[PDB]
């Protein structure tokens, strides 16, 4: 239930989606940086808060930001 956001500074490094261990981030056609690629978070209902995404974007400050919100069973990473 955490809120992921992708600001318009992604240079299409594709590392955010490679790092996320939940299949949350995916690439999308969006012209404007170099290769008409951008990130997209359609499956935010599965992000646990790993913040592996933010630890990969080599932008000035950041282009993908995770905001920890309401906690659920999927986001808590529980298996019991």
């Amino acid at each position: 239930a955490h809120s992921v956001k992708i600001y318009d500074t992604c240079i299409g490094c594709t590392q955010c989606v490679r790092a996320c261990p939940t299949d949350v981030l995916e690439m999308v056609p969006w012209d404007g940086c170099k290769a008409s690629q951008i990130a997209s978070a359609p499956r935010t209902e599965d992000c646990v808060g790993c913040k592996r995404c933010e630890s990969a974007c080599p932008t000035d400050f950041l282009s993908v930001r995770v905001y920890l919100g309401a906690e659920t069973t999927r986001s808590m990473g529980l298996a019991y």
């Binding site: 992708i6 995916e26 690439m27 999927r74």
Partner: protein, 141 residues
């Protein structure tokens, strides 16, 4: 693309473990992963221990989604094996998740919509002191 359909393919050989399913899998969701292999190797289970996958089709049910993605990334990297995994509800309603449109989320693909994309630089969001008594937070705008 039409999402692949489940079947009754066999399961990898495994002597058991104490890191398997729990009651969460009968009152809530649980996941199942399949793949295709050309021989019989030894692969490390994401729940502890090793198992010998079988030739051709294999099907494995786990307890979380992160387990399936971990095992699938390990497969795609070490064995060069493509895979999918689903989520099954208590009432037997299968839902197809990972290769949602066939292509993995790394490679670009047409017919994909952008979600959660803001048309501004991260350092431009308004302060949290104008949007008070108004549940818009700072960034959903």
């Amino acid at each position: 693309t039409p999402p692949t359909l489940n079947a009754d393919t066999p399961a990898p050989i495994f002597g058991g473990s104490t890191g398997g399913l729990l009651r969460k899998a009968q009152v809530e969701e649980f996941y199942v992963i399949t793949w295709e292999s050309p021989k019989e190797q030894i692969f490390e289970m994401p729940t502890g221990g090793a198992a010998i996958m079988r030739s051709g089709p294999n099907l494995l049910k786990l307890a979380r989604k992160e387990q399936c993605l971990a095992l699938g990334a390990r497969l795609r990297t070490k064995f060069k094996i493509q895979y999918q995994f689903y989520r099954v509800f208590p009432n037997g309603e299968v839902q197809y998740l990972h290769p949602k449109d066939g292509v993995y989320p790394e490679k670009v693909n047409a017919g994909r919509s952008p979600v959660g994309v803001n048309n501004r630089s991260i350092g431009k969001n308004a302060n949290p002191a104008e949007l008070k008594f108004a549940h818009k937070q700072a960034y959903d705008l």
